[PDB]
Amino acid sequence: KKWFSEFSIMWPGQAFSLKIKKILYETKSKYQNVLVFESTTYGKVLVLDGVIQLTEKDEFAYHEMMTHVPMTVSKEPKNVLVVGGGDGGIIRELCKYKSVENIDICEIDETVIEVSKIYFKNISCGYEDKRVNVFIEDASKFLENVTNTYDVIIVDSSDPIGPAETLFNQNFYEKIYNALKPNGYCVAQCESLWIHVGTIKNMIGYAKKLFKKVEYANISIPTYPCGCIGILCCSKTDTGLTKPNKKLESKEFADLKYYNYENHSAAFKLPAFLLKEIEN
Amino acid sequence: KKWFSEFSIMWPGQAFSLKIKKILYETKSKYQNVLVFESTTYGKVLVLDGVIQLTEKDEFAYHEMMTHVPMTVSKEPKNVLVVGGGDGGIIRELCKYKSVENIDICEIDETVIEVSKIYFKNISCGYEDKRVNVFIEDASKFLENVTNTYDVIIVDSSDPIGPAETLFNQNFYEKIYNALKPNGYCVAQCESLWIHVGTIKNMIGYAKKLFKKVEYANISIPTYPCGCIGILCCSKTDTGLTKPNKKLESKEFADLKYYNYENHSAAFKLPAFLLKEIENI
Ligand SMILES: CSC[C@H]1O[C@@H](n2cnc3c(N)ncnc32)[C@H](O)[C@@H]1O
Ligand SMILES: CSC[C@H]1O[C@@H](n2cnc3c(N)ncnc32)[C@H](O)[C@@H]1O
C-alpha cells in the first residue's frame, strides 16, 4: 500500500505525504497532470501537477473563508466571478447567497470541472444552480476587456507554476481592479506566511498600487504546505474586509463547518513577525 | 540526502518530512529515543520517539503562546511550574517577566535537558537564571502532595504515547488543580483540532470536572501534525483566559515573533465544527 508525497521547488526541504487507499483517475489534460485518489484518512484528494489542491476532509475551511469573508462585507452583491476554482467549492458557498444574480466562473481546464463533477459531488454540486455561467478560458485573457462588472472577484488559482503563472503579476491585478465595481472587493489565494514572506510582500505591493485597502488573512488547512494558506484581501473602499456587515443566519448557512462571525476578524490577526514584515 | 519522516499511530495515513542536512545526536535515554538533526530549512530539530518536539525556525510560536497567554492574564504571578519542557523554551519566555520570583520545572527525562544545552542554546538559555529550579521526576508523582503553591502551571508535554501518558488523565488534572493557588491558571498542550478531537474532548471533560472555566486556543505551527496545536486553558475564575490584563511592550519583550495582545484573543476563535464538538462534551 503506497503513499502520495507532495514535494516541490516552491517549498524545498519539506514534504507532506498521504497514504493511498486507491487511485481513482490520472490523466494529462491540455494544461496539467490531474490525479484523483482516495486517501486512507482525508477522503478523496485532487492533485494538479503534483500539488494538493483539495481533500474532502478539509476543503470547507478554504472554500468557506475565501467566500464568506468578502460576501459578508459586500452589500447586495449581484455579480460575482470565480477565477480558477474548477472543483466548484467556491461556487457551492456562493450559491448560498440567494440575492446574487450571476455567478460567473472562468476556469482554464475543463477536465478539472469534469473530474470534480464525477469524483467530488459534495464539492461540485453548485454547478447545477441556474445562476452559474462557465467560461473555459485563461482568466488573464477573460478579464482583459471587462470593466465595472463584478461586486466580488474570488481568485481561487492553482500555484504560480503551471497555467496559473499569469495570475500572480501586477498586470492581472490591474485587470481585477478594472473589472470590479467602484466599491467591489477581490480576495486571492496567497502564499503561506511560514514559506515565502517575500512573495506575500510582492503581492501586497502589486495590489496597493491600485487598491485603497489591502489586508492579509490566514486560514488553517492541514493539507496545504505548512498547514495554512493566505488570503490577499483587496478593497476599493477604506473600510476593508476585516469586519463582516452581516451574520449568516439563514438556513443555507446553518451547516457551515469553519467560518463564523468571530473567526472572520480573527483570521486577520497575524503573527507579530509577519505584521512587522508587511507594515514595513 | 536522506529525509526524516514523522509517522505515528496518533496521525495515521499522514506524514510530514524534513530533509536532513546532518544527524547530530541519537541515543536511547531511560525513557525515550532521542534524536537531534539539522534540517535543510528549519534548522535544528529535536525528535522524541519519532515525533518532532521543536524546530529552531518555528518554536517561538508554540513557546510564546503557551507562556504569554496565562502570564498576561494572571495579575501578579510569582511562582510558576513548567511540566515537561526540557528544551527550556517555556522557561526562556517566563524569565522575561522580571517580577516572577520562582520557576520550577519538572521534566521526567534529564537527557532532554542535557541535549538542549548542547544543541539548542537559544532555547535552553533560561536554565542559567537563578530563579530556575529543576526536578527530574514524573510530574504526576511530583505533584502528589503539592498544594496551593503555583500561580501558573504550564504543561508542555510530549504526546500521550510514551512517558506523557500519565499527564493525559483525570488524576493529573486533580493534582494540577490542588497544586494551583485559589486564582491560579493552567495551560496544557492539547493536540491538533484537525485529527485529535477525541483527545481534545477527553481533556476538556477532565478539566471541566474541576475548573470553573475551560477554554481551548489554537496556535499555527507548521512542524506539528496538521500545522497546528491547541492549548487547553483552565481557570478557577469565571473570567477565564481569553483577555489579557497586561501588554508585553517593555524591552524584555522586544524579541516576540508571534504573540501580541490581539493574537491572544484571536487564538480562541475556533472553527465552527470544533465549537459544535466541544458543545457535545
Ligand atoms: C482546482 S482550484 C484551482 C484552479 O485554477 C485553474 N487555473 C489555473 N490557471 C488558470 C488560469 N490562468 N485561468 C483560469 N483558471 C486557471 C486550475 O486549472 C485549477 O482548476
Ligand atoms: C520536549 S518538551 C516535552 C517534554 O515532556 C517530557 N515529559 C513526558 N512525560 C513526562 C512526565 N510524565 N513528566 C514530566 N515530563 C514529561 C518529555 O520527556 C519531554 O522533554
Author numbering:
A (entry chain B): 41 to 320
B (entry chain C): 41 to 321
Which text from the study accompanies this structure?
Spermidine synthase (SpdS; putrescine aminopropyltransferase) catalyzes the transfer of the aminopropyl moiety from decarboxylated S-adenosylmethionine to putrescine, leading to the formation of spermidine and 5′-methylthio­adenosine (MTA). The active site of SpdS is located between the domains and consists of two interconnected clefts for binding dcAdoMet and putrescine.
The occupancy of the two ligands is 100% in all of the molecules in the asymmetric unit, suggesting that complete conversion occurs in the crystals. No changes were observed in residue conformations around MTA or spermidine compared with the structures containing either dcAdoMet or putrescine.
